[PDB]
Amino acid sequence: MARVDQTPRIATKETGESLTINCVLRDTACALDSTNWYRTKLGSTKEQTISIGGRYSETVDEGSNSASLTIRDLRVEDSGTYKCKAIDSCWLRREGAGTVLTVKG
Amino acid sequence: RQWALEDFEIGRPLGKGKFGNVYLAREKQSKFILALKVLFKAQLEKAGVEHQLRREVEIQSHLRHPNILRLYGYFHDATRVYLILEYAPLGTVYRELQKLSKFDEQRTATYITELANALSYCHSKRVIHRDIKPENLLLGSAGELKIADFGWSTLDYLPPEMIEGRMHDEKVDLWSLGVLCYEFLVGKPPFEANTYQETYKRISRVEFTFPDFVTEGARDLISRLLKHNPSQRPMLREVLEHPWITANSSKPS
Ligand SMILES: Nc1ncnc2c1ncn2[C@@H]1O[C@H](COP(=O)(O)OP(=O)(O)O)[C@@H](O)[C@H]1O
Numbered sequence: 001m002a003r004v005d006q007t008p009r010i011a012t013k014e015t016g017e018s019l020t021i022n023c024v025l026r027d028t029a030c031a032l033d034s035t036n037w038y039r040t041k042l043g044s045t046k047e048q049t050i051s052i053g054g055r056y057s058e059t060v061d062e063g064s065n066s067a068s069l070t071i072r073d074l075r076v077e078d079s080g081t082y083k084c085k086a087i088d089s090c091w092l093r094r095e096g097a098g099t100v101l102t103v104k105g
Numbered sequence: 106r107q108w109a110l111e112d113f114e115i116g117r118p119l120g121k122g123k124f125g126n127v128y129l130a131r132e133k134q135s136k137f138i139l140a141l142k143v144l145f146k147a148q149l150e151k152a153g154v155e156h157q158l159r160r161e162v163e164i165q166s167h168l169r170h171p172n173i174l175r176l177y178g179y180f181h182d183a184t185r186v187y188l189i190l191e192y193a194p195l196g197t198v199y200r201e202l203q204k205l206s207k208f209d210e211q212r213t214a215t216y217i218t219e220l221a222n223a224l225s226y227c228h229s230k231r232v233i234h235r236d237i238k239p240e241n242l243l244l245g246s247a248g249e250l251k252i253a254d255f256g257w258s259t260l261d262y263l264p265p266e267m268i269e270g271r272m273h274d275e276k277v278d279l280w281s282l283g284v285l286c287y288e289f290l291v292g293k294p295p296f297e298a299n300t301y302q303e304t305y306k307r308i309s310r311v312e313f314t315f316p317d318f319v320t321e322g323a324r325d326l327i328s329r330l331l332k333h334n335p336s337q338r339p340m341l342r343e344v345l346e347h348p349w350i351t352a353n354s355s356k357p358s
Contacts, residue, residue, distance in 0.1 A: 033156065034156060034159045034160050034163065036160065036163050036164060046229070046230070047167065047230065048229075048230050048231040049164070049230060049231040049232055050231075051231070085163060086159075086163060087159040087160075087162055087163045087179075088159075089159075090181075091106075091159065091179070091181045091186055092106070
């Protein structure tokens, strides 16, 4: 019953806005403390790492056992599918189901 | 941990590491021969690197390329973590340099081609490596090179921008290729010195010289890779196309 719930699952934004993605690790005491973030551009399936900095920021909440990614000043080129992936403090693999972002614009 | 210890036959040790040993192993259903790396949790938590290692193993688990050591999976029990690895039968590049002192131009150019191929794949996924040392390169059945340290994002191998505490990016990987090309042809890295302080200064001021036997083609490539300004180093595509590389390499891009 341990699982990662990643929300929102689908998101539509306009150029200039912001998006926050939340990944919550439920039903376990294992810590979600090592999250790496990934994106696949529209049209592709090939996954690229996301570097934290610039328009990209991250927060972690021990109480909710969650990790969040925030992207500011959204551009059309930001559109694609985002995923959180981790090996938690119990050495177990955890992955969110994905956020499909479309930016119009 | 959908994999378990009962899934594998264990053979002889392949070597001893800082946090445990590596064993020859065989997956029972397929009879496939592999390496099983056994890490002791206590040693991990003593060097203070367990959290860092979990981030690195997660990145490694996505990398599939002929010149990157494959991670097939991982599992654990109460005291140990097990990594399921590709078996590299011919040992490290470091040991080969010990046995030969230095490499001829064919072996050097072939190794640099294989490394440039791997790093081009990594850059396509926005993955960069830290410093790359000969001890971190294993050799496969056909003598092909494999990047084996999981070092994804030791003074003699670091670029000027990093020891000067400046900004850095994928261009650090080109500096690494320059240091290794020199070390393969000459037998030692180009900024080696007696003290930490001297080495630091040599790197920062790009102070190195060539033995006279190093050919014009090799000098040209090394001099282009070891630029102080990161933005002046070539693209990986330009390395793979360099006339010294194509004249000497026994493998393609
Ligand atoms: N996948 C592998 N295939 C064959 N031999 C290996 C493999 N991994 C490690 N070895 C051998 O065992 C030794 C273990 O070293 P390593 O695992 O790199 O230790 P550490 O974790 O301290 O760096 C290596 O020097 C190498 O000779």
